[PDB]
Design a protein around this ligand. Structure first.
Ligand SMILES: Nc1ncnc2c1ncn2[C@@H]1O[C@H](COP(=O)(O)OP(=O)(O)OP(=O)(O)O)[C@@H](O)[C@H]1O
Lengths: 258, 458, 86
């Protein structure tokens, strides 16, 4: 609302709620009154080759336009640029990964003279800077300890939760849950994966599971897909940069390096 | 789970991490391949259909099995079937004599537990067993183990409840050995000064053994720095004092046994406070035992199993009421303690489930005269021969009670059982009819319902 | 629409919105019922707290079901009570 720049960029670690934030924001826009006629949600992360046809189809569907199959891409881009030129639109790009011309797909770059706002998210600050959104940038901070704990219970069965939830009486299971929740580091996707994998605890093995999870995260279920989802950010770097990144892991856990 | 994870660790299927074994068990139970079943969650079982499916998969697999457990086999199968398989299991059988020498090069695991009639084996049985990794001879009546110098890959041994007399010196030639279990050895006499020969050992066990570390002279485990869990049976105070200096060896005593102890008139958990891994404590036949001290010092160790046996001189155990190390106690067994007359502190054990008492003719009540019942998780109480047990305790909530057995308790007039509690988990109650009739009940429904639904007369 | 969808034997986690099924919320009256051979996949469906374990049938139920799959020339050879036969 207050922002003087029509392009808003959000960046953060993979799976820290960027897509979730866009979903909740888009759903909450219907509560408030606004002058924006159309709100468009676009998922660009479908490919790193900029699959333009899907984006054009989504925009055309959102504007009640008659989609055509044989129309050339450039002519459609001009047609949508003219179409979006008379409407105050809110387009929500999700997880953009490489710089791409907005006019190429058909999205007109909003200017101060127009009331349209553009919101995009990314895993990289550099690509957000490439979108002329260097001054609507917000870093997605990880969730707090209280938020992480309350989210952790939502992914546990009560036969386990009623074994951990109660206060007053102190049991080792609650402290083990403290270790596990803090080990996930407040990253919501990591909390979801671990909590789903740890929804089935009974009392006996709470100690050993907490002991091992603090050291080796491979053995707990569901982590392979989590790493695969987070694997891409490493893969984008050059082999020299990759070797530099893996050299940083040798420093002690929860430390600080100059 | 402890046995199965141990065999998995010895087999090499696990990277020296037991928690991954727990994880694999979780994957199996979550896929309904296995089902947890038992008094505690520590025991699981396999369904009959799943067992048949596993046998069928073995038949379709290249790795043939020769598994004949629990069919009461009186004569072991000929060596022809053994020579090609990879894993053999003949547990829970009635095998008497074993004569053939197998030619099993590919066999890696053997299971010959629960064989009361098995007492003798042919010499040279182990020569062809170059690939063996897991070996068990528990719950048998053998006295000696034949030559096993050809076992270049054994890691696990378990001779629990076995009347072994002397360990052959061939074991010290095995540098790959990892686990030894020698509990409940009533005929054991070999010295443990020879254990220093091995270097890569992880676990020992001398719990409830006829011969243990009787003096400081026998204590030479400092050489084995690879050990993580040990079982030790103490016979004199000097062993405990020598164990009472700060070193990783001292803190590794997870479970402790006291048998035929001399000059052990008193014992303090402060003397045991150097041990952060101690859970189980067994005391049997110590003449000196006069008093036991349970200090308020909350040692990180979480004792869960306590058993006191044959202590005519044991007078009392002092337990701090506000905060004590016994708050983690899972089970109590007190046997033959005629002078023990102060056990009221049991009411402070909120995590107590199983009780067995026998011939402790000095205890008036288990509890004599937080906003919760003292025993909400209580499951089992056993009393036998208690001549001077006037009562058990005051009425308390036992929602999880399942089994109760009391015999030969003439002074036992009342029990904390009442109809005010909910009854949906109880399954069986044992005891003599005369004692049941002699009991005094606050409500007659406590008699009719119990005697018609879950009372099992002897 | 207040819908009741009955998924049968789900085996891997999959997004409900991917196929077109909206994830029901407390604000809606729609109920989703799914079955699986694995507890983990059921936990992955945010159904960790509507979980029921399918216990096997009892001895009496197993016996009465067993007769339903037998011919009477065999059943009348086994069904009768009173007289005891191997
Ligand atoms: N505040 C939150 N509460 C509950 N779940 C959350 C929250 N934030 C994120 N999540 C969970 O995070 C999961 C992954 O989506 P998320 O929005 O975190 O990804 P992302 O940051 O867009 O990832 P990527 O960088 O891969 O595009 C979702 O399944 C969602 O349930």
């Amino acid at each position: 609302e207050k922002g003087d720049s029509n392009i808003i960029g959000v960046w953060g670690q993979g799976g820290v709620g960027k897509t979730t934030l866009l979903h909740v924001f888009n759903n909450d826009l219907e509560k408030k009154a606004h002058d924006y006629q159309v709100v468009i949600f676009i998922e660009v992360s479908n490919s790193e080759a900029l699959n333009t046809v899907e984006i054009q189809q989504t925009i055309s569907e959102r504007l009640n336009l008659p989609w055509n199959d044989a129309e050339p891409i450039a002519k459609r881009a001009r047609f949508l640029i003219k179409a979006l030129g008379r409407k105050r639109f809110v387009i929500l790009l999700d997880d953009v990964r490489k710089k791409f011309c907005l006019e190429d797909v058909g999205i007109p770059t909003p200017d101060i003279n127009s009331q349209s706002k553009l919101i995009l998210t990314s895993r990289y600050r550099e690509v957000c800077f490439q979108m002329n959104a260097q001054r609507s940038l917000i870093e997605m901070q990880i969730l707090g300890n209280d938020a992480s704990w309350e989210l952790f219970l939502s992914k546990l069965s009560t036969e386990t939760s009623a074994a951990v939830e109660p206060l007053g009486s102190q049991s080792a299971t609650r402290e083990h849950a403290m270790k596990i929740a803090q080990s996930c580091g407040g990253l919501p996707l990591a909390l979801n994966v671990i909590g789903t994998a740890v929804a089935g605890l009974e009392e006996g093995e709470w100690q050993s599971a907490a002991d091992a999870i603090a050291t080796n995260m491979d053995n707990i279920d569901g982590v392979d897909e989590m790493f695969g989802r987070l694997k891409y950010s490493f893969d984008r770097l050059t082999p020299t940069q990759q070797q530099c990144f893996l050299y940083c892991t040798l420093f002690p856990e929860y430390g600080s390096i100059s | 789970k402890e046995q199965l994870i141990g065999y998995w660790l010895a087999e090499g299927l696990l990277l020296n991490d037991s928690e991954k074994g727990y994880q694999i068990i979780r994957s199996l139970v979550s896929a309904c391949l296995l089902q947890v079943s038992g008094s505690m969650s520590s025991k699981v079982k396999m369904h009959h259909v799943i067992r048949q499916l596993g046998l069928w998969l073995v038949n379709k697999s290249d790795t043939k099995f020769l598994v004949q457990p629990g069919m009461a086999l009186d004569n072991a199968p000929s060596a022809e079937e053994w020579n090609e398989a990879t894993r053999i299991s003949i547990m829970s059988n009635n095998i008497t004599e074993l004569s053939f020498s197998p030619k099993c090069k590919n066999v890696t695991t053997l299971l010959m537990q629960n064989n009361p009639n098995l007492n003798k084996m042919s010499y040279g049985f182990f020569r062809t067993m170059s690939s063996l990794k897991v070996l068990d001879l528990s719950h048998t009546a053998i006295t000696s183990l034949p030559e096993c110098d050809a076992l270049v890959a054994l890691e696990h041994l378990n001779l629990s409840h076995t009347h072994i007399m002397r360990l052959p010196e061939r074991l010290w030639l095995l540098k790959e050995l990892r686990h030894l279990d020698l509990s409940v050895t009533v005929a054991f006499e070999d010295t443990m000064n020879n254990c220093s020969k091995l270097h890569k050992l992880k676990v020992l066990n001398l719990f409830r053994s006829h011969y243990g570390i009787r003096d400081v002279d026998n204590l030479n485990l400092d050489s084995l720095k690879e050990l993580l869990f040990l079982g030790i049976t103490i016979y004199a105070e000097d062993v405990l004092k020598k164990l009472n200096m700060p070193r990783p060896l001292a803190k590794s005593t997870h479970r402790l046994n006291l048998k035929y102890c001399a000059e052990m008139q008193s014992i303090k958990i402060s003397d045991l406070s150097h041990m952060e891994h101690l859970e189980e404590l067994y005391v049997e036949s110590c003449y000196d035992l006069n008093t036991v001290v349970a200090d308020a010092e909350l040692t990180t160790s979480q004792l869960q199993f306590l058993t006191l046996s044959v202590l005519p001189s044991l007078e009392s155990v002092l337990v701090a009421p506000m905060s004590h190390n016994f708050q983690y106690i899972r089970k109590l067994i007190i046997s033959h303690c005629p002078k023990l007359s102060n056990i009221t502190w049991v009411r402070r054990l909120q995590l107590l489930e199983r009780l067995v008492i026998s011939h402790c003719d000095g205890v008036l009540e288990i509890v004599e005269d937080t906003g919760q019942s003292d025993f909400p998780k209580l499951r089992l109480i056993v009393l036998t021969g208690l001549k001077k047990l006037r009562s058990i305790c005051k009425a308390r909530e036992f929602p999880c009670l399942e089994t109760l057995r009391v015999e030969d308790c003439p002074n036992l007039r009342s029990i904390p059982l009442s109809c005010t509690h909910n009854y949906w988990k109880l399954k069986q109650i044992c005891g003599s009819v005369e004692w049941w009739e002699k009991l005094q009940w606050e409500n007659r429904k406590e008699v009719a319902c119990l005697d018609s639904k879950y009372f099992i007369p002897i």
